[PDB]
Amino acid sequence: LNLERALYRIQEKRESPEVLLTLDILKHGKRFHATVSFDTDTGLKQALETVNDYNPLMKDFPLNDLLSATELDKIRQALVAIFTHLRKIRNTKYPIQRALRLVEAISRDLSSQLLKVLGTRKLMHVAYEEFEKVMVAC
Amino acid sequence: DPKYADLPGIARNEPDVYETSDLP
Amino acid sequence: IANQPVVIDNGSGVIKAGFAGDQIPKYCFPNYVGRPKHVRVMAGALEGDIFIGPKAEEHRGLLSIRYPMEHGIVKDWNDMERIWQYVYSKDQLQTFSEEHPVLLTEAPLNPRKNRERAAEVFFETFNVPALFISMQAVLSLYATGRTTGVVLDSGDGVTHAVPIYEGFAMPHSIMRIDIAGRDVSRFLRLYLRKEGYDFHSSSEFEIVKAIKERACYLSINPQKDETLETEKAQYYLPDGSTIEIGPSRFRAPELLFRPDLIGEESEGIHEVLVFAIQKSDMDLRRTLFSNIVLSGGSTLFKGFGDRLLSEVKKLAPKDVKIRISAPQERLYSTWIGGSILASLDTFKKMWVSKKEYEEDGARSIHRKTF
Amino acid sequence: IANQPVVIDNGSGVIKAGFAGDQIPKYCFPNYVGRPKHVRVMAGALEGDIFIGPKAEEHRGLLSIRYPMEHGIVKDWNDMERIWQYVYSKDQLQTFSEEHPVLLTEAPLNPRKNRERAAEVFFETFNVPALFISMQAVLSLYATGRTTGVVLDSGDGVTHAVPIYEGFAMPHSIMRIDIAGRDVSRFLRLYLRKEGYDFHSSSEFEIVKAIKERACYLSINPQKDETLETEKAQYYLPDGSTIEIGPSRFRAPELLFRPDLIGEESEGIHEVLVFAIQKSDMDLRRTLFSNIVLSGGSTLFKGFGDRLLSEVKKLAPKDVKIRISAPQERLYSTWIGGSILASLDTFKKMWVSKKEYEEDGARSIHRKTF
Ligand SMILES: Nc1ncnc2c1ncn2[C@@H]1O[C@H](COP(=O)(O)OP(=O)(O)O)[C@@H](O)[C@H]1O
Ligand SMILES: Nc1ncnc2c1ncn2[C@@H]1O[C@H](COP(=O)(O)OP(=O)(O)O)[C@@H](O)[C@H]1O
């Protein structure tokens, strides 16, 4: 999100016709070194459209549900909601290995929320039905 | 122009752009 | 080491070099492979036995100037050994083969063999860190700022038209010819014998080229000015000897438009470029009429492009606005274009690492050259 | 959703796009599917490598232009996806599928498979909540205000009269046919070869289409005007290259009425309309005689409907008053009529709730698209 926001801000800075006008004077001076390198050699536009490609996947993701729920039903349906949000794949073109290890890190974040919700009963000594019901729902 | 002076094999008095007499 | 890369403004007749980012190459010199033809009698005589630079530019009365780049195409790799051997002089470099990346250039429609053997040289004998070699037309377009444009580039035994739209892979449409000023100057030596000037040395040929760039122009009327009485411009040697010219100064470049005058079937620069136009598309053709990149020092003549404008006007149909772009530095446009391209960060993939060629071969780079 | 409902102008040849309430389809463009025919070895060229919009509508021969709607029946799907991504482009939409109600139009008797693909797109890739897929002639009835009428569409490879009466489901009576000016223009490329014009590109075909849409018409007298000889007026290429038009301008569209010129047995869809008339009833036939609609871009020709008038006059019996209605905005009639229907409250029941519809499979709206 910070990347997209910075893309917007600095792209307005980029598209500031004053600096572009300085570049007009520079190209009029034919010093195409800096001008052409600033245009071509800067892969900023590529980064812009790349984050614009990931833009819907980087938008309204239901991850806070795992951060704000201690119910296996809520968490499980939150998993489903998250999963559905993760269908923006081919329409975003994210790196396979980065996607794998990304969702892998997400699974670790999930396990962290699982330990968070887990640390509340200790049904090994307290009631066995807690063990039964909670274990099954888990 | 300064680079045009810096190197020897550079001639002048000829416009770098040659176009047709585009009759309007 | 990947420091400021050495931008080498090559060339059939004038092969020089400089760096990236800079706007003036510090090593400006042509193509010339000379060596003394006499016996050192008195000791203390200046030597080196392979004279290039001020030696050659000083001791012209003793050297046998050789040329591997026949029509730009190298024919003598040993002469290339000596060429770079002189290039590799620190007074000519102030570096090593590895102290800077190298940026060498090419001409379109050339065999692999050239790149192969050269890669062997600069990555085995010499040991260049990073280097890529390609057409000078692209670099010229860099200097023009244009991307879509027919690069009319001419060497000195080379004359060619390179149609380009944003640097696309169009080798069928892209043309190339290898015939120019070397041969024209040789034909001027033929003029000399017809005039009575008994000359047959390469050093004399240098002077003919000095006239070519100096006391030789163009006209626009072939037959008309041929019928028109000349003035016989008396050239003067370094000695100062009277050398009349006549209309031969512009008569010899008629062969560039009339290739059969030397007995060589072709169609002239104009028609060959028109053939390149034919391979393009009507809409893109109009752009290329407006996008004409004349380049090469050989193209420096009085109304050169203006005559050619009239030629293509007689060739191209009506309501066709032809526009030429031809800077005064139709040499360094390639050098500055390489100075910019070599100054890029994406250029990593564009260059070729030393070890890469040292791993498998130049065919990988031949994949990279297209 | 409480936003402006998108009206997909899924034109066969020219697939435009727009919304409801508006009277102008947002963006108009054909089935062109371009990809460059070269390689941008030079850095500084243009990106994309797939071109929809002025990128392709400005450079054609450079790009491998494609067209998958095999007589409307699209075969590409990935390209369609990208086209719809381009539908949400910056100039184009900058919106979401979820953010807008979308309405699709279709030709009758299309394969369910295409609708399945569309469901996959707008329910997996895109996520339109209010997505409905409809017919195309009903739209024309909305624009004309009529309810009863013979709607003749005119695509690039799809033309068929749609005899409607107050939206009554008459699939047996109503006739669908997929053929139009595509192969007529290609047949004109056959004429080009028979007249010495070496053209094989779709871009060249588009130039011929510019002639088709521009310098072509329907001569009401078939052989009375065909057996004669025209002066073959001259057409000018993008370069301005003079090319004669010829009798072809009216000779080639006769194939629309004389399908055996290509060899395919058919009637000349006006006779298929007569078959629809036969399927209808005597006095109701008279209503449809008085009610004929001409939509689609390919309707635009001189004496087009007038020649067809003469045809039916040679077909329909005596005291048969027939009336046609050809709105100036043929393709837009469908678009504006889609805007009309998309601007309806009853129309909310036409589609099915997105997620449940996905769970409902496709047969539900397949049964509800009638
Ligand atoms: N005024 C001139 N008239 C004719 N020829 C020239 C002139 N100036 C330079 N040349 C020739 O043009 C050639 C330079 O153009 P360039 O593209 O650098 O070609 P090259 O490949 O020969 O170096 C030189 O070799 C030189 O002999
Ligand atoms: N002035 C014109 N004359 C003839 N045909 C035209 C004209 N303008 C557009 N067209 C035709 O419209 C067709 C485009 O197909 P289109 O009408 O978009 O399909 P659909 O009828 O399904 O919308 C092409 O045949 C094109 O030739």
UniProtKB/Swiss-Prot annotation, chain A:
Q: Where are the transmembrane segments?
A: none
Q: Where in the cell is the protein located? A: Cytoplasm, Cytoskeleton
Taxonomically, which superkingdom?
Eukaryota
What is this protein's function? Cytoplasmic dynein 1 acts as a motor for the intracellular retrograde motility of vesicles and organelles along microtubules. Dynein has ATPase activity; the force-producing power stroke is thought to occur on release of ADP. Plays a role in mitotic spindle assembly and metaphase plate congression.
Give the disease entry from the UniProt record: Charcot-Marie-Tooth disease, axonal, type 2O: An axonal form of Charcot-Marie-Tooth disease, a disorder of the peripheral nervous system, characterized by progressive weakness and atrophy, initially of the peroneal muscles and later of the distal muscles of the arms. Charcot-Marie-Tooth disease is classified in two main groups on the basis of electrophysiologic properties and histopathology: primary peripheral demyelinating neuropathies (designated CMT1 when they are dominantly inherited) and primary peripheral axonal neuropathies (CMT2). Cortical dysplasia, complex, with other brain malformations 13: An autosomal dominant disorder characterized by global developmental delay with impaired intellectual development. Some patients show signs of peripheral neuropathy, such as abnormal gait and hyporeflexia. CDCBM13 is associated with variable neuronal migration defects resulting in cortical malformations.
Family per similarity comment: Belongs to the dynein heavy chain family.
The protein, known as = Cytoplasmic dynein 1 heavy chain 1
Gene that encodes it: DYNC1H1
From Swiss-Prot, chain B:
The domain of life is Eukaryota
Task: PTM Phosphotyrosine: list the residues.
Answer: 4
Region Disordered: start and end of each range? 1-23
Compartments annotated for it: namely: Cytoplasm, Cytoskeleton; Cytoplasm, Cytoskeleton, Microtubule organizing center, Centrosome; Membrane
UniProt lists the family membership as follows: Belongs to the dynactin subunit 2 family.
Subunit: Subunit of dynactin, a multiprotein complex part of a tripartite complex with dynein and a adapter, such as BICDL1, BICD2 or HOOK3. The dynactin complex is built around ACTR1A/ACTB filament and consists of an actin-related filament composed of a shoulder domain, a pointed end and a barbed end. Its length is defined by its flexible shoulder domain. The soulder is composed of 2 DCTN1 subunits, 4 DCTN2 and 2 DCTN3. The 4 DCNT2 (via N-terminus) bind the ACTR1A filament and act as molecular rulers to determine the length.
Function statement: Part of the dynactin complex that activates the molecular motor dynein for ultra-processive transport along microtubules. In the dynactin soulder domain, binds the ACTR1A filament and acts as a molecular ruler to determine the length. Modulates cytoplasmic dynein binding to an organelle, and plays a role in prometaphase chromosome alignment and spindle organization during mitosis. Involved in anchoring microtubules to centrosomes. May play a role in synapse formation during brain development.
Q: What is this protein called?
A: Dynactin subunit 2
Organism field: Sus scrofa (Pig)
Swiss-Prot record, chains C, D:
For this protein, the record's Gene3D superfamilies field holds: 3.30.420.40, Actin, Chain A, domain 4
GO MF annotations in UniProt: ATP binding
Which Gene Ontology cellular-component terms appear in the entry? Answer: cell cortex; centrosome; dynactin complex
Q: Which UniProt keywords apply?
A: Acetylation, ATP-binding, Cytoplasm, Cytoskeleton, Nucleotide-binding
Keyword presence, Cytoplasm: yes
Quote the InterPro entries the UniProt record gives. Answer: Actin, Actin/actin-like_CS, ATPase_NBD
Task: Tell me if Acetylation is a UniProt keyword of this record.
Answer: yes
Pfam families recorded: Actin
> Where is this protein found?
Cytoplasm, Cytoskeleton; Cytoplasm, Cytoskeleton, Microtubule organizing center, Centrosome; Cytoplasm, Cell cortex
Function in brief: Part of the ACTR1A/ACTB filament around which the dynactin complex is built. The dynactin multiprotein complex activates the molecular motor dynein for ultra-processive transport along microtubules.
PANTHER family per UniProt: ACTIN
Describe the family membership recorded for this protein in Swiss-Prot or TrEMBL: Belongs to the actin family. ARP1 subfamily.
Q: How does it assemble?
A: Part of the ACTR1A/ACTB filament around which the dynactin complex is built. The filament contains 8 copies of ACTR1A and 1 ACTB. Interacts with dynein and adapters such as BICD2. Interacts with BCCIP (isoform 2/alpha).
Indicate what this protein is called per its UniProt record: Alpha-centractin
Its source organism is Sus scrofa (Pig)
